Design a binder for this molecule. Sequence first.
Ligand SMILES: Nc1ncnc2c1ncn2[C@@H]1O[C@H](CSCC[C@H](N)C(=O)O)[C@@H](O)[C@H]1O
Ligand SMILES: Nc1ncnc2c1ncn2[C@@H]1O[C@H](CSCC[C@H](N)C(=O)O)[C@@H](O)[C@H]1O
Lengths: 662, 651
Amino acid sequence: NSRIHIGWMATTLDVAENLDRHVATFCTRLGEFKYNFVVYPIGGVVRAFWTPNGSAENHPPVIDLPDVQLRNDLWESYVVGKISPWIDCDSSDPAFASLSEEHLLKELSYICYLGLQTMAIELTRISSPRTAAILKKWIWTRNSRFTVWVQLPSAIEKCKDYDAFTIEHVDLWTIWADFRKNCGNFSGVYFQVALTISSELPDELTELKLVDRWKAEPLAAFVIESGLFISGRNGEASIPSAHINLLKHLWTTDALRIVLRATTDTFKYNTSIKSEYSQALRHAVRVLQAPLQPLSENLDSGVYNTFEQDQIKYDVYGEAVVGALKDLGADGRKTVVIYLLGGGRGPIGTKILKSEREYNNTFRQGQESLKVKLYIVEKNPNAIVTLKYMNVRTWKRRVTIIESDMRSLPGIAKDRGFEQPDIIVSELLGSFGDNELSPECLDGVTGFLKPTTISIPQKYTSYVKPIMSTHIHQTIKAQSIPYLSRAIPSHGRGEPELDEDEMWIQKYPQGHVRNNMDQIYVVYLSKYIPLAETTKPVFTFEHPNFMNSSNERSDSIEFVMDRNADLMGFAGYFDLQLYKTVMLSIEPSTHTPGMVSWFPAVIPLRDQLRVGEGDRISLKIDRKVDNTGVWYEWHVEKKKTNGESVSTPIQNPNGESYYMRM
Amino acid sequence: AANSRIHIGWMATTLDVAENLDRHVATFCTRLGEFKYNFVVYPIGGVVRAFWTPNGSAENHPPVIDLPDVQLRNDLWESYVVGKISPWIDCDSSDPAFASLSEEHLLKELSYICYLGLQTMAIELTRISSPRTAAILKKWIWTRNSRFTVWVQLPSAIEKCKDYDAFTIEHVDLWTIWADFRKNCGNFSGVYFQVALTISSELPDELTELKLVDRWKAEPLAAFVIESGLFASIPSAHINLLKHLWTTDALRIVLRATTDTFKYNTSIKSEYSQALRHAVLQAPLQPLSENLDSGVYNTFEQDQIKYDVYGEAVVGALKDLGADGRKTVVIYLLGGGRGPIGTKILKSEREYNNTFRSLKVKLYIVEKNPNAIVTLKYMNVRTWKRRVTIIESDMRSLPGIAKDRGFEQPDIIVSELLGSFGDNELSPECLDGVTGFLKPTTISIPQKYTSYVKPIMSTHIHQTIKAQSIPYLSRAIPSHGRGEPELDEDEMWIQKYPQGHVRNNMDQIYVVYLSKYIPLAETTKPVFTFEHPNFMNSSNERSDSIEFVMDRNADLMGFAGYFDLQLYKTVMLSIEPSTHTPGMVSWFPAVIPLRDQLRVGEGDRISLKIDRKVDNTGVWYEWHVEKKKTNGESVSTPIQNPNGESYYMRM
Ligand SMILES: Nc1ncnc2c1ncn2[C@@H]1O[C@H](CSCC[C@H](N)C(=O)O)[C@@H](O)[C@H]1O
Ligand SMILES: Nc1ncnc2c1ncn2[C@@H]1O[C@H](CSCC[C@H](N)C(=O)O)[C@@H](O)[C@H]1O
């Protein structure tokens, strides 16, 4: 069994009750039937198998395949996401085509969210130009690297655009080659074709001269239809000599997975011949990181889950909350309004509830309980998909799930009849504190709170410290972009484009190295050395910013060198008081023990600046703000004992190399 | 920690300069090993060259590089021996002539570390400032495709530097030295470009003053140099330093024979170590343009059957010519390499004389590769019994240097200057070079060759070729075309591709083991022929138009390339699909790729147009395709590699 992997393709013929909710027991039992992975519709079965043929008001079901119902590594191993069948960007009806584009995008974004390893997309035309374009740009601009199975039709004739009177020189291969070209010939290691086999085997799949083609193609899968018999024995579920010769012919590597497709409404041996098919099949072939940007990119579930593995952050948050409910609760209140701002998968939600309960059992002993109404505000739609499932299962529909960018609540609040909060709770922190746009995010929410409203975090502050490491510097400098990565979006103001070959490219006018040097980074400081014994304060922020103090900043941060050495840049840190006494910090001196939540930031210098015992170092750093985003410009000013003073060039002018947007 | 965990090396020294040593490193290192230490530092020139001392005028010069490779199989070399530059070299000598000399020999030495195919190598800094040395080094490592570790060995202390002057040495120290040199080679990845400390008997300030000592934790610290200036025992501060800076067990440590004229108890050798421990595409090769490293020869010499067949054509020519009645024949082996074809000629005379007969054979083995000559001298001595005259020359100027050194006209000239596409290594031009002094009777082995081309389909090969990428450390590797590295605005080496990266990828020939693909035809066709001796000096420039018909819906990505060559009359060898010599691995197929995959179907007519052009300084291919449907329509792809801009085989 081991060496051969065989997937089961979810079909309209195993749509049971709440299957989207119970994918666990699904792949479980299916697994019992001796097949490992599955091709499940990533939109959810209520969405995949929907039918558009209705009034102009028949809208498509929202994505509803919650991730929490299964640990992410399992999603990654077993499940393989197929795009909803009703999608057709190349519909003959312009409006449905547009609709199709939009929704294809949604499903792609979700495939990313669940963090799936492999994904199927089934062509239904002889030509899919629009689909090709959408997919092309997608894959070529994603920082991710998932695999893509392009399932083909059984034969030319099943195609929607098939005209038996104009197929001059077409076959299944021409289809695949045309699609593959149309997405820009991405790597076979990643862009792969899946053949669909059935009762009828076309000539091109038997006439040797043609079947040989698929050996020179990035073939990754055969999708086998249950169109077949029970010849011999106890009714042996078996396969034609031509079929066999085919699955044996092209079965080169044991990587190639085999999906089975249930065409026949045979509930089968009452669900116990699946394994018979499976058997039949098997026996016939045998360190730098960019800072996160939650505001402008949607965090996948991996990022979130990892976040969760740092339970200490959440514990501290809970303590902060109980403290708040204590300073407010001592007043003898009954009910209190809280807003979690950017809930993610909602660990701080469950934790906040946990806090209302603990607070009640310790403080309200033998007296009226203080109850909390909880609004969770969030923008990532996939995340929302998780927040609703959570709300249902664990939270008992108590919490109000508001999908929006919080910086917009001030409008939809009084309208949809939401009352002002007493506490707003957010966790939008970069390693450099405000490098993840927190101040602008939370500042967006001020127009709708009471002067009473206590905000957590209350305060946070960005620190810094000169370091020396030829390794970190030499590593930042030498980052290069391989062909497959040529169109991944820059962290700067510019975005990918089409070149003279109608191919996506991300140009870097300032130059590649430069572009490397004018960015912040988050690193696990390996082979470095401190040049200062202690760090210094850079940038503070306090919420709620009731007075609308400008979010932009400017500063000089000066140190003093005690030895001959090469200064390669600074390590940036941060600490934050959630509420009063309760706080957590990433700073070397005041570091929360055991906390892996944040690695230090690094503000690199273009060139390793040399220094010696005596010189005063003035790190100029400005945090400039823009209609469309925020960025750090920075540089160094060395001054020797004799007053003589030099300075390095201003790195990141206008955020051209590193520009956090909104 | 455990014994095998902590690695210890033995630096050579005048303290152990035995006789004939440069001809016997195997046993040397074997004894070394018996004394419980794995690797060994050793001068690449060989001791005789290594410890030479300039004193006379231009009358006396440095000993030639004479550390032969053959004395030990290449993997052994690659494992144990760490090469080290002769201490007498000083690219930064105060004397201009000596610095020039130093640059030349520093180069020869580097070239040799490449030749032997060593993994690691060490160079000793003897100045507070070594700018010229750093430039030669810089250009070397940036333009070398050869990835390989390097140790910058530091002096005992700032004081013993050649340019030491207690009057200007304001704020300078061993680390300042290292940071200057590291900065002057461009801050090459410390994964390769590293620094070794030499721990003297007197421990400096910066290596005990903790705050200072910590400097080396932020540096590519590679190895510790340990002088015998100790008692075997080791001082408190020494212990604390060696412990302190020793982070990765990956660090290495070498023994430096300084004070002890020898070890009283031989065992005092073994003691020290102990006491310390107690702490896929490829370009077509181009032998005329680039000197081959020794492992290329070492694997080149696994192709038993090439030598076998060469020897077969040799016995054949000794039959045909020897049958005359004479008792002697002269033969020029043109490009001996490491010489197995020479030993094959001598083995073929030796083996001819008893089945067909005397007929003594005089051998002239010519060779350009200055590093191979070491191997052909050691080879001429160890096996050949000095019966063969080695000639280190461009075989293309041999006709001229024929009288000055008393050379005799050749009856036969044996050579192997072909590649996986036959003529792709530029054999015709050099043999045409040797042409001008050949007797009219001279048979050229081989006599002829012809190239072959075969339409193929493989998305994998095509994508692979197109996606070729240059990372930062490889930014200065020279092009395969007319272009060469140049200094950028930061005085940093870069190889510019003004035609574009992708174009540069697609306008080149490759050699690949055909992995995932399909042939779009069932038989190859004739491309470019050539015939030696080219007695009339015909133009090596060629221009043909091969033809192929297509029989199915396919994506044509280019042609696979092959060759055949006749050595003499009947016997011969060929890499071609059907006629392919069995058992060979001598030549994987060429790939002449098209820029974008060409779509084809049943009945398409494909004309491959190839012009083999030649230049004053090199040669190149200019190829493309014409497609013509059954209807007679005729598209045509763009001329690839025009003027060898992407591909130009220099001479
Ligand atoms: N402007 C904004 N409006 C709404 N949500 C935002 C936002 N900016 C960031 N977020 C959300 O805030 C989250 C930051 S990561 C924090 C997730 C969760 N609080 C945890 O600690 O595990 C992301 O999930 C992102 O979707
Ligand atoms: N113009 C030239 N003059 C002298 N030698 C040349 C030359 N052009 C090429 N060569 C030599 O010819 C050899 C071709 S490869 C053959 C190597 C060797 N005969 C073997 O089979 O192992 C190279 O080693 C190169 O050094």
